[PDB]
Amino acid sequence: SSSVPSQKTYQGSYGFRLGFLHSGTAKSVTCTYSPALNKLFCQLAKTCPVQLWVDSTPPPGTRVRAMAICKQSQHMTEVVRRCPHHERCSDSDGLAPPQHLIRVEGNLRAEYLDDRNTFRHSVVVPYEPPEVGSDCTTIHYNYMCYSSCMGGMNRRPILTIITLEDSSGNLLGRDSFEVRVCACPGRDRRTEEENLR
Ligand SMILES: [Zn+2]
């Protein structure tokens, strides 16, 4: 009735870790990642490219799961879901449950899970190796509530946990990042980094 997934970074046998575009903080950026904060800033329901880097190719049937949790210990048993307003909106892509914060864009093989025991939401896709001309695999995520949505992200720091799993669900790798969904990611990142003095 209470639990939390592990957030322990784990590179594993295949050298798994995340990467992000180096987009800077101009006002026009639709998303941007802060290395100093390990924090992705993005806009509501827009493309967030997240890169999967491995040193060696994982086995057939490997999968990539994303799940959101509250970062603070006093809230980590609370399931992260969309707020009442956005859950009722007509923004369904035909695949994602209306309550799920995290969607995958542009992948018809995305699978969405309400865990039967923990009730937590996640979205999982097949692992694909990098395409011709690329050195990493990119997943396009969408975050479907704002950080300020009460009943949703609740103005709480939220962590996204990305896990590399084998076909049976066993852990092969894990990485994570804080996520802020906001109107102007470039300005918000530069403002939060200004305090790093
Ligand atoms: Zn919302």
PDB file of all heavy atoms in Angstrom, residues 77-102, unseen atoms left out:
ATOM      1  N   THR A  77       5.585   8.623  -1.646  1.00  0.00           N
ATOM      2  CA  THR A  77       4.594   7.555  -1.765  1.00  0.00           C
ATOM      3  C   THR A  77       3.384   7.949  -2.603  1.00  0.00           C
ATOM      4  O   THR A  77       2.548   7.085  -2.888  1.00  0.00           O
ATOM      5  CB  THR A  77       4.100   7.083  -0.388  1.00  0.00           C
ATOM      6  OG1 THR A  77       3.258   8.083   0.199  1.00  0.00           O
ATOM      7  CG2 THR A  77       5.274   6.803   0.533  1.00  0.00           C
ATOM      8  N   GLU A  78       3.267   9.215  -3.005  1.00  0.00           N
ATOM      9  CA  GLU A  78       2.112   9.692  -3.753  1.00  0.00           C
ATOM     10  C   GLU A  78       2.293   9.443  -5.248  1.00  0.00           C
ATOM     11  O   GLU A  78       3.315   9.820  -5.826  1.00  0.00           O
ATOM     12  CB  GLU A  78       1.901  11.182  -3.485  1.00  0.00           C
ATOM     13  CG  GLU A  78       0.603  11.737  -4.029  1.00  0.00           C
ATOM     14  CD  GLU A  78       0.217  13.033  -3.355  1.00  0.00           C
ATOM     15  OE1 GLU A  78       0.895  13.411  -2.371  1.00  0.00           O
ATOM     16  OE2 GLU A  78      -0.757  13.672  -3.807  1.00  0.00           O
ATOM     17  N   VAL A  79       1.297   8.811  -5.872  1.00  0.00           N
ATOM     18  CA  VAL A  79       1.360   8.536  -7.306  1.00  0.00           C
ATOM     19  C   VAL A  79       1.224   9.837  -8.086  1.00  0.00           C
ATOM     20  O   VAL A  79       0.301  10.629  -7.849  1.00  0.00           O
ATOM     21  CB  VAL A  79       0.264   7.538  -7.712  1.00  0.00           C
ATOM     22  CG1 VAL A  79       0.211   7.389  -9.234  1.00  0.00           C
ATOM     23  CG2 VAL A  79       0.502   6.206  -7.042  1.00  0.00           C
ATOM     24  N   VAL A  80       2.131  10.053  -9.034  1.00  0.00           N
ATOM     25  CA  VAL A  80       2.096  11.238  -9.885  1.00  0.00           C
ATOM     26  C   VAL A  80       1.135  10.994 -11.042  1.00  0.00           C
ATOM     27  O   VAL A  80       1.304  10.048 -11.818  1.00  0.00           O
ATOM     28  CB  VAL A  80       3.499  11.590 -10.402  1.00  0.00           C
ATOM     29  CG1 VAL A  80       3.420  12.821 -11.298  1.00  0.00           C
ATOM     30  CG2 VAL A  80       4.446  11.822  -9.237  1.00  0.00           C
ATOM     31  N   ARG A  81       0.113  11.843 -11.153  1.00  0.00           N
ATOM     32  CA  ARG A  81      -0.885  11.737 -12.208  1.00  0.00           C
ATOM     33  C   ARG A  81      -1.213  13.140 -12.708  1.00  0.00           C
ATOM     34  O   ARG A  81      -0.815  14.140 -12.110  1.00  0.00           O
ATOM     35  CB  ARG A  81      -2.140  11.001 -11.710  1.00  0.00           C
ATOM     36  CG  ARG A  81      -2.567  11.398 -10.304  1.00  0.00           C
ATOM     37  CD  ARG A  81      -3.789  10.607  -9.824  1.00  0.00           C
ATOM     38  NE  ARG A  81      -3.647   9.161 -10.004  1.00  0.00           N
ATOM     39  CZ  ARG A  81      -3.584   8.276  -9.009  1.00  0.00           C
ATOM     40  NH1 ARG A  81      -3.648   8.681  -7.748  1.00  0.00           N
ATOM     41  NH2 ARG A  81      -3.463   6.981  -9.273  1.00  0.00           N
ATOM     42  N   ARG A  82      -1.919  13.210 -13.835  1.00  0.00           N
ATOM     43  CA  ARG A  82      -2.376  14.497 -14.344  1.00  0.00           C
ATOM     44  C   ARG A  82      -3.450  15.092 -13.443  1.00  0.00           C
ATOM     45  O   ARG A  82      -4.208  14.374 -12.782  1.00  0.00           O
ATOM     46  CB  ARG A  82      -2.944  14.361 -15.752  1.00  0.00           C
ATOM     47  CG  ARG A  82      -1.936  14.016 -16.809  1.00  0.00           C
ATOM     48  CD  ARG A  82      -2.635  13.808 -18.131  1.00  0.00           C
ATOM     49  NE  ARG A  82      -2.727  15.036 -18.902  1.00  0.00           N
ATOM     50  CZ  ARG A  82      -3.461  15.179 -19.998  1.00  0.00           C
ATOM     51  NH1 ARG A  82      -4.214  14.176 -20.444  1.00  0.00           N
ATOM     52  NH2 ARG A  82      -3.453  16.334 -20.641  1.00  0.00           N
ATOM     53  N   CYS A  83      -3.534  16.421 -13.463  1.00  0.00           N
ATOM     54  CA  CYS A  83      -4.513  17.154 -12.678  1.00  0.00           C
ATOM     55  C   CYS A  83      -5.917  16.943 -13.250  1.00  0.00           C
ATOM     56  O   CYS A  83      -6.071  16.476 -14.382  1.00  0.00           O
ATOM     57  CB  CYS A  83      -4.155  18.644 -12.656  1.00  0.00           C
ATOM     58  SG  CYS A  83      -4.527  19.572 -14.177  1.00  0.00           S
ATOM     59  N   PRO A  84      -6.962  17.286 -12.481  1.00  0.00           N
ATOM     60  CA  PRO A  84      -8.333  17.076 -12.985  1.00  0.00           C
ATOM     61  C   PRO A  84      -8.630  17.804 -14.283  1.00  0.00           C
ATOM     62  O   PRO A  84      -9.327  17.259 -15.141  1.00  0.00           O
ATOM     63  CB  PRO A  84      -9.211  17.595 -11.836  1.00  0.00           C
ATOM     64  CG  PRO A  84      -8.389  17.409 -10.621  1.00  0.00           C
ATOM     65  CD  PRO A  84      -6.945  17.611 -11.044  1.00  0.00           C
ATOM     66  N   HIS A  85      -8.141  19.032 -14.453  1.00  0.00           N
ATOM     67  CA  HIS A  85      -8.404  19.750 -15.696  1.00  0.00           C
ATOM     68  C   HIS A  85      -7.827  19.012 -16.906  1.00  0.00           C
ATOM     69  O   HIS A  85      -8.530  18.756 -17.891  1.00  0.00           O
ATOM     70  CB  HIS A  85      -7.832  21.164 -15.608  1.00  0.00           C
ATOM     71  CG  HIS A  85      -7.889  21.911 -16.900  1.00  0.00           C
ATOM     72  ND1 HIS A  85      -9.042  22.509 -17.361  1.00  0.00           N
ATOM     73  CD2 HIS A  85      -6.941  22.145 -17.837  1.00  0.00           C
ATOM     74  CE1 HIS A  85      -8.797  23.094 -18.520  1.00  0.00           C
ATOM     75  NE2 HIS A  85      -7.532  22.881 -18.835  1.00  0.00           N
ATOM     76  N   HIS A  86      -6.542  18.668 -16.856  1.00  0.00           N
ATOM     77  CA  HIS A  86      -5.912  18.119 -18.050  1.00  0.00           C
ATOM     78  C   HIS A  86      -6.367  16.690 -18.324  1.00  0.00           C
ATOM     79  O   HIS A  86      -6.404  16.267 -19.484  1.00  0.00           O
ATOM     80  CB  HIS A  86      -4.395  18.205 -17.923  1.00  0.00           C
ATOM     81  CG  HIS A  86      -3.857  19.575 -18.191  1.00  0.00           C
ATOM     82  ND1 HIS A  86      -3.077  20.256 -17.283  1.00  0.00           N
ATOM     83  CD2 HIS A  86      -3.997  20.395 -19.259  1.00  0.00           C
ATOM     84  CE1 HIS A  86      -2.759  21.440 -17.781  1.00  0.00           C
ATOM     85  NE2 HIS A  86      -3.302  21.546 -18.982  1.00  0.00           N
ATOM     86  N   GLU A  87      -6.727  15.942 -17.283  1.00  0.00           N
ATOM     87  CA  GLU A  87      -7.265  14.597 -17.501  1.00  0.00           C
ATOM     88  C   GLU A  87      -8.549  14.626 -18.328  1.00  0.00           C
ATOM     89  O   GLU A  87      -8.814  13.688 -19.093  1.00  0.00           O
ATOM     90  CB  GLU A  87      -7.501  13.915 -16.152  1.00  0.00           C
ATOM     91  CG  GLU A  87      -8.328  12.638 -16.202  1.00  0.00           C
ATOM     92  CD  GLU A  87      -8.573  12.050 -14.819  1.00  0.00           C
ATOM     93  OE1 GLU A  87      -8.138  12.665 -13.822  1.00  0.00           O
ATOM     94  OE2 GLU A  87      -9.211  10.979 -14.728  1.00  0.00           O
ATOM     95  N   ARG A  88      -9.345  15.696 -18.212  1.00  0.00           N
ATOM     96  CA  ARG A  88     -10.614  15.798 -18.927  1.00  0.00           C
ATOM     97  C   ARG A  88     -10.501  16.457 -20.294  1.00  0.00           C
ATOM     98  O   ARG A  88     -11.493  16.485 -21.030  1.00  0.00           O
ATOM     99  CB  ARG A  88     -11.647  16.608 -18.129  1.00  0.00           C
ATOM    100  CG  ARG A  88     -11.731  16.341 -16.650  1.00  0.00           C
ATOM    101  CD  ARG A  88     -12.420  15.043 -16.297  1.00  0.00           C
ATOM    102  NE  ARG A  88     -13.115  15.177 -15.018  1.00  0.00           N
ATOM    103  CZ  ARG A  88     -12.509  15.194 -13.834  1.00  0.00           C
ATOM    104  NH1 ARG A  88     -11.189  15.082 -13.755  1.00  0.00           N
ATOM    105  NH2 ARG A  88     -13.224  15.326 -12.724  1.00  0.00           N
ATOM    106  N   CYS A  89      -9.330  16.987 -20.642  1.00  0.00           N
ATOM    107  CA  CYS A  89      -9.154  17.686 -21.905  1.00  0.00           C
ATOM    108  C   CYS A  89      -9.274  16.719 -23.079  1.00  0.00           C
ATOM    109  O   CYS A  89      -9.076  15.508 -22.947  1.00  0.00           O
ATOM    110  CB  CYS A  89      -7.793  18.385 -21.954  1.00  0.00           C
ATOM    111  SG  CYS A  89      -7.638  19.874 -20.927  1.00  0.00           S
ATOM    112  N   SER A  90      -9.605  17.273 -24.245  1.00  0.00           N
ATOM    113  CA  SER A  90      -9.638  16.486 -25.477  1.00  0.00           C
ATOM    114  C   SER A  90      -8.283  16.581 -26.180  1.00  0.00           C
ATOM    115  O   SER A  90      -8.137  17.176 -27.249  1.00  0.00           O
ATOM    116  CB  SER A  90     -10.774  16.958 -26.375  1.00  0.00           C
ATOM    117  OG  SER A  90     -12.013  16.926 -25.687  1.00  0.00           O
ATOM    118  N   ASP A  91      -7.272  15.977 -25.549  1.00  0.00           N
ATOM    119  CA  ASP A  91      -5.921  15.948 -26.100  1.00  0.00           C
ATOM    120  C   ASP A  91      -5.400  14.523 -26.257  1.00  0.00           C
ATOM    121  O   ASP A  91      -4.193  14.327 -26.421  1.00  0.00           O
ATOM    122  CB  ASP A  91      -4.958  16.776 -25.241  1.00  0.00           C
ATOM    123  CG  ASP A  91      -4.790  16.232 -23.819  1.00  0.00           C
ATOM    124  OD1 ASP A  91      -5.202  15.088 -23.523  1.00  0.00           O
ATOM    125  OD2 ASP A  91      -4.216  16.964 -22.985  1.00  0.00           O
ATOM    126  N   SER A  92      -6.286  13.529 -26.195  1.00  0.00           N
ATOM    127  CA  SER A  92      -5.866  12.136 -26.292  1.00  0.00           C
ATOM    128  C   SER A  92      -5.242  11.842 -27.652  1.00  0.00           C
ATOM    129  O   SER A  92      -5.740  12.281 -28.693  1.00  0.00           O
ATOM    130  CB  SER A  92      -7.060  11.211 -26.057  1.00  0.00           C
ATOM    131  OG  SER A  92      -6.754   9.880 -26.442  1.00  0.00           O
ATOM    132  N   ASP A  93      -4.140  11.090 -27.641  1.00  0.00           N
ATOM    133  CA  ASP A  93      -3.503  10.656 -28.874  1.00  0.00           C
ATOM    134  C   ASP A  93      -3.979   9.277 -29.311  1.00  0.00           C
ATOM    135  O   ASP A  93      -3.430   8.715 -30.263  1.00  0.00           O
ATOM    136  CB  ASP A  93      -1.972  10.680 -28.729  1.00  0.00           C
ATOM    137  CG  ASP A  93      -1.441   9.620 -27.766  1.00  0.00           C
ATOM    138  OD1 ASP A  93      -2.234   9.011 -27.020  1.00  0.00           O
ATOM    139  OD2 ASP A  93      -0.210   9.407 -27.748  1.00  0.00           O
ATOM    140  N   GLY A  94      -4.987   8.729 -28.636  1.00  0.00           N
ATOM    141  CA  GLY A  94      -5.510   7.418 -28.944  1.00  0.00           C
ATOM    142  C   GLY A  94      -4.819   6.268 -28.244  1.00  0.00           C
ATOM    143  O   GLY A  94      -5.350   5.147 -28.252  1.00  0.00           O
ATOM    144  N   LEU A  95      -3.661   6.498 -27.644  1.00  0.00           N
ATOM    145  CA  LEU A  95      -2.907   5.438 -26.987  1.00  0.00           C
ATOM    146  C   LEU A  95      -2.764   5.640 -25.490  1.00  0.00           C
ATOM    147  O   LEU A  95      -2.906   4.685 -24.728  1.00  0.00           O
ATOM    148  CB  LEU A  95      -1.502   5.317 -27.605  1.00  0.00           C
ATOM    149  CG  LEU A  95      -1.380   5.047 -29.103  1.00  0.00           C
ATOM    150  CD1 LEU A  95       0.088   4.973 -29.483  1.00  0.00           C
ATOM    151  CD2 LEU A  95      -2.103   3.756 -29.483  1.00  0.00           C
ATOM    152  N   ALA A  96      -2.484   6.868 -25.044  1.00  0.00           N
ATOM    153  CA  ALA A  96      -2.137   7.079 -23.647  1.00  0.00           C
ATOM    154  C   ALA A  96      -3.395   7.207 -22.794  1.00  0.00           C
ATOM    155  O   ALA A  96      -4.357   7.860 -23.202  1.00  0.00           O
ATOM    156  CB  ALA A  96      -1.293   8.337 -23.486  1.00  0.00           C
ATOM    157  N   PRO A  97      -3.403   6.608 -21.610  1.00  0.00           N
ATOM    158  CA  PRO A  97      -4.495   6.847 -20.659  1.00  0.00           C
ATOM    159  C   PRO A  97      -4.578   8.323 -20.318  1.00  0.00           C
ATOM    160  O   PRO A  97      -3.547   8.997 -20.187  1.00  0.00           O
ATOM    161  CB  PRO A  97      -4.084   6.016 -19.436  1.00  0.00           C
ATOM    162  CG  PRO A  97      -3.132   4.964 -19.994  1.00  0.00           C
ATOM    163  CD  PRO A  97      -2.386   5.691 -21.071  1.00  0.00           C
ATOM    164  N   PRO A  98      -5.785   8.866 -20.164  1.00  0.00           N
ATOM    165  CA  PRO A  98      -5.911  10.309 -19.911  1.00  0.00           C
ATOM    166  C   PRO A  98      -5.277  10.764 -18.607  1.00  0.00           C
ATOM    167  O   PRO A  98      -5.014  11.963 -18.458  1.00  0.00           O
ATOM    168  CB  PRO A  98      -7.431  10.534 -19.898  1.00  0.00           C
ATOM    169  CG  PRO A  98      -8.021   9.207 -19.559  1.00  0.00           C
ATOM    170  CD  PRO A  98      -7.088   8.182 -20.201  1.00  0.00           C
ATOM    171  N   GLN A  99      -5.046   9.862 -17.651  1.00  0.00           N
ATOM    172  CA  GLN A  99      -4.460  10.253 -16.374  1.00  0.00           C
ATOM    173  C   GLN A  99      -2.934  10.277 -16.388  1.00  0.00           C
ATOM    174  O   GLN A  99      -2.331  10.773 -15.428  1.00  0.00           O
ATOM    175  CB  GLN A  99      -4.929   9.311 -15.257  1.00  0.00           C
ATOM    176  CG  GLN A  99      -6.431   9.361 -14.964  1.00  0.00           C
ATOM    177  N   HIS A 100      -2.294   9.758 -17.434  1.00  0.00           N
ATOM    178  CA  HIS A 100      -0.842   9.610 -17.434  1.00  0.00           C
ATOM    179  C   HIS A 100      -0.135  10.926 -17.740  1.00  0.00           C
ATOM    180  O   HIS A 100      -0.411  11.570 -18.756  1.00  0.00           O
ATOM    181  CB  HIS A 100      -0.415   8.548 -18.455  1.00  0.00           C
ATOM    182  CG  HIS A 100      -0.518   7.145 -17.950  1.00  0.00           C
ATOM    183  ND1 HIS A 100       0.391   6.164 -18.293  1.00  0.00           N
ATOM    184  CD2 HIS A 100      -1.435   6.548 -17.149  1.00  0.00           C
ATOM    185  CE1 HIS A 100       0.054   5.032 -17.702  1.00  0.00           C
ATOM    186  NE2 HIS A 100      -1.048   5.239 -17.002  1.00  0.00           N
ATOM    187  N   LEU A 101       0.817  11.293 -16.874  1.00  0.00           N
ATOM    188  CA  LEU A 101       1.615  12.502 -17.080  1.00  0.00           C
ATOM    189  C   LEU A 101       2.536  12.364 -18.288  1.00  0.00           C
ATOM    190  O   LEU A 101       2.642  13.283 -19.113  1.00  0.00           O
ATOM    191  CB  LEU A 101       2.431  12.806 -15.820  1.00  0.00           C
ATOM    192  CG  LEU A 101       3.399  13.997 -15.902  1.00  0.00           C
ATOM    193  CD1 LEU A 101       2.612  15.305 -15.967  1.00  0.00           C
ATOM    194  CD2 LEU A 101       4.388  14.022 -14.739  1.00  0.00           C
ATOM    195  N   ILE A 102       3.223  11.231 -18.411  1.00  0.00           N
ATOM    196  CA  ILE A 102       4.245  11.049 -19.434  1.00  0.00           C
ATOM    197  C   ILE A 102       3.682  10.247 -20.598  1.00  0.00           C
ATOM    198  O   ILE A 102       3.192   9.124 -20.411  1.00  0.00           O
ATOM    199  CB  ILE A 102       5.489  10.349 -18.862  1.00  0.00           C
ATOM    200  CG1 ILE A 102       6.027  11.098 -17.644  1.00  0.00           C
ATOM    201  CG2 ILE A 102       6.563  10.223 -19.939  1.00  0.00           C
ATOM    202  CD1 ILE A 102       7.243  10.405 -17.018  1.00  0.00           C
TER     203      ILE A 102
END
